[PDB]
């Protein structure tokens, strides 16, 4: 994807001057697709802005117009800045892919239920799978989304792992948004962990890991990673399993004191330079 993006960019450097700028929409669209494949948001926003200022006067068939809105919603959904605008881009993209292609439509509504399931609202998912309009485009793809929405409205974890286990043979071809799905899994995992551990100052690991009936390997690794991220006060244990939570409120004392010592060292050293200069 490196030589294709570089060669394509150098092709744009000599094709922006050539007439019939409507052809540049394909190579700039693929440019945004490979910038998202390389996980580069700023340059995808600059080249995407070039695609907007290019397709503002150019009005090619909606085969390329709706893909700009869909890929725009994917770019905005990569950083998770605002789900409303991205949901609007996926909505207009679904309006563009309406009744033109079955896989593009099922992946358009799949992207709608994705960007809308990321904001924790399954009621609209049920409203979209209960309507007769989107019912004719249903299939094996939307079943996994119904399992994700069911696990989200039920606040279950082992059921979500069951959705990631039984449907992995339609989750094997899942797009790069798999990292976002793991971010939702880790989000509900964070909610449960800060839900059951918070009232338990010191408790058994099996008494608190029994309700979730999961192994302590992945949970222990995620917990240790979150303490290493220093988001809250806590520490794990393996031999005894003792949980200890503590904090150090007076932080502004040692910092200001250390700054006074470090700043005054230069004062005394400069004084020794003035005296050492005036004496010898």
């Amino acid at each position: 994807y490196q030589e294709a993006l570089h060669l394509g960019s150098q092709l744009l450097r000599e094709l922006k001057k050539m007439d019939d700028k409507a052809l540049l929409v394909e190579v700039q669209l693929l440019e945004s697709k490979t910038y998202h494949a390389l996980s580069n948001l700023p340059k995808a926003r600059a080249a995407l802005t070039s695609a907007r200022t290019t397709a503002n006067a150019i009005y090619c068939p909606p085969k390329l117009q709706a893909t700009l809105d869909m890929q725009s919603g994917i770019i905005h959904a990569a950083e998770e800045k605002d789900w409303k605008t991205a949901y609007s881009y996926f909505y207009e993209a679904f309006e563009g892919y309406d009744s033109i292609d079955s896989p593009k439509a099922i992946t358009s509504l799949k992207y709608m239920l994705l960007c809308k399931i990321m904001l924790n609202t399954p009621e609209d998912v049920q409203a979209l799978v209960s309507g007769k309009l989107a019912l004719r485009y249903a299939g094996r793809q939307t079943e996994a989304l119904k399992c994700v929405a069911q696990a989200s409205k039920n606040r279950s974890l082992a059921d979500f792992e069951k959705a990631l286990t039984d449907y992995r043979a339609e989750l094997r071809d899942d797009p790069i948004i798999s990292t976002h799905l793991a971010k939702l899994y880790d989000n509900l995992l964070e909610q449960n962990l800060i839900r059951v551990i918070e009232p338990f100052s010191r408790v058994q690991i099996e008494h608190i890991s029994s309700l979730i009936k999961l192994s302590k390997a992945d949970v222990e690794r995620k917990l240790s990673q979150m303490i290493l991220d220093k988001k809250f006060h806590g520490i794990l244990d393996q031999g005894e399993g003792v949980l200890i939570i503590f904090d150090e409120p007076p932080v502004d004392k040692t910092y200001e004191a250390a700054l006074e010592t470090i700043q005054n060292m230069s004062k005394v050293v400069d004084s020794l330079y003035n005296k050492a200069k005036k004496l010898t």
Partner: protein
């Protein structure tokens, strides 16, 4: 109502079982008890969640006192299983039980003994105790010194 007003002493509900039974038997007053138990599930929710509401409300009352009731023994005196007490704790996690301390080895819980910042907690207690002894000692000293003047 007087037992449910304040200072709920830990007593057995078996004495209230026959009180509710005769509450369903007598018809001179509070007659529509069968109307309270009209539905097959609503009355069961009111009874189970009523005994649950008092068996949690008494915990909310004794939570103010720091006497360390040792609920491990209280579960033995109440003759109930610890599983539904863990479910009661599952009602405490939403009942704002964040101010507590548990133990991994034993089962004794602690509703007190915080980190105790000496600048706020011990400072406040030393202010109320020391200052209360200062002004309180100041009142009865010269007050009694003026009370003994009438003997002359």
């Amino acid at each position: 109502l007087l037992k449910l007003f304040t200072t709920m002493e830990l007593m057995r509900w078996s004495t209230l079982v026959e009180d509710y039974g005769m509450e369903l038997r007598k018809g001179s007053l509070e007659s529509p008890a069968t109307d309270v138990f009209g539905s097959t599930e609503e009355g069961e929710k009111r009874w189970k969640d009523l005994k649950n509401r008092v068996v949690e409300h008494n915990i909310r009352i004794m939570a103010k006192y720091y006497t360390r009731i040792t609920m491990k023994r209280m579960a033995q005196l109440l003759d109930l299983s610890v599983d539904e007490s863990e479910a009661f704790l599952s009602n405490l996690v939403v009942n704002k039980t964040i101010f507590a301390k548990v133990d991994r080895l034993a089962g004794i819980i602690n509703f007190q003994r915080p980190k105790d910042p000496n600048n706020l907690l011990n400072d406040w207690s030393q202010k109320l105790n020391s200052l209360m002894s200062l002004v309180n000692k100041t009142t009865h000293l010269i007050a009694k010194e003026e009370m003994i003047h009438n003997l002359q």
